[PDB]
Amino acid sequence: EIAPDAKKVAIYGKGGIGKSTTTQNTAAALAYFFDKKVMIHGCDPKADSTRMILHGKPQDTVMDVLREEGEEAVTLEKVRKIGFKDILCVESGGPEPGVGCAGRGVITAVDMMRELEGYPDDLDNLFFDVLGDVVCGGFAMPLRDGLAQEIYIVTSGEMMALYAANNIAKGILKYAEQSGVRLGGIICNARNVDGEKELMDEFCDKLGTKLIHYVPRDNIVQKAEFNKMTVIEFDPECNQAKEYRTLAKNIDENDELVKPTPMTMDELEELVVKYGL
Template structure:
């Protein structure tokens, strides 16, 4: 079983990318489980066609752990993709990162996850909280892809995630598998992401162009693979899924300083 996690700055498009990759993998015949580790519980929206109505933490607020059944927290999405949302605390109450810990521990105790070829964790943030680092720290995920654009703060978050991966790599199997560029149409973006990946001692797994098809699919609560399967954008996600399945270029990342990062971004912004 492949254990993969997508990390990146909030709002960078992790959930959209994860859902389209999950859909593509499923259409390729793989048994896929996507686990949303974001308190907004919207990771699997495009696969389910709606916001998940029953997260793990929702169930724990209404039932004793021993009374929760697998069907309470495991849902089936597009083309049979298994969908789970960890959920989060009520707004303004509690720690969202702690919610991930509780949810994943419960799934483990229940042996709730079906047999899968690929388990894909969609994780919020840049590993500043122990809860969000849990998929890396506890070995739930071994292959980490960082979703980033060419914008400075997105790259800053990516660099922080690389620091977290490097820290935990010394005591486990976790490795950086690549950068996924989710374009924001900034100057020299693809070239910048390629060089940024090289400095982190990894590669650019994919460069996803900014395309209105993605927005249209999201408005219909669908992945691009479902909404526009013959589109060029769908093919981009298929190629990314194929890359993930065949990728063996995993590494312990080498994060850079913020000064080096600023200079790198300025260099590409100036040249273009």
């Protein structure tokens, strides 16, 4: 059993909207503000889900080490690094270019970490940062396998971002009965578009879920990331750090998860027309 006493969560979302930045800062805020043992297992082959916790040194992926150095080289000292506030970090990596299923590569990396006993039993929080650009059978494997039954969807007030969120919701619904997976809520990484908060409220209401937090747009993210670090580490006192603190508190106390009611093509089109997207 992977981290039986931890709150295991899966963060799914499209790329290009700050999903990795929000996940890293949420983990940092749990470790920093609530003294929690945290781990992040990256499951997005096109995103660096741990660099800001590792102060800008990108870690080797489990799959790349297995493909280039071999299975024996896949060791905890090699693929699992410790970062800000002792957060543990692991990156699954991608499949054999042009041949392997990327969702299978994710599961192989998780299985390999299991065999290595790489998930501390005293973890308080484990995050799996999964690609949500496409809810293909491969990237839905974490949902089918119940890697984590608490799922959060990162979105933004942009058409493709909401389409992806709605499709992640369909994938959660697909396996809710079989794997017990549930939607804990929607995280909006604000894009700052007219009506964005109202759009998010309606979106959440139509899917039968809730907005766990509206993460504002703040240039301190770029300043902190420029120093290859999280906002929490860069300046724990600033307003954006307190936003991530509230998000982290909300995701960690949450005990009301739901089987989502995704919107149909026509309903989604009506919604993005109403808010002029």
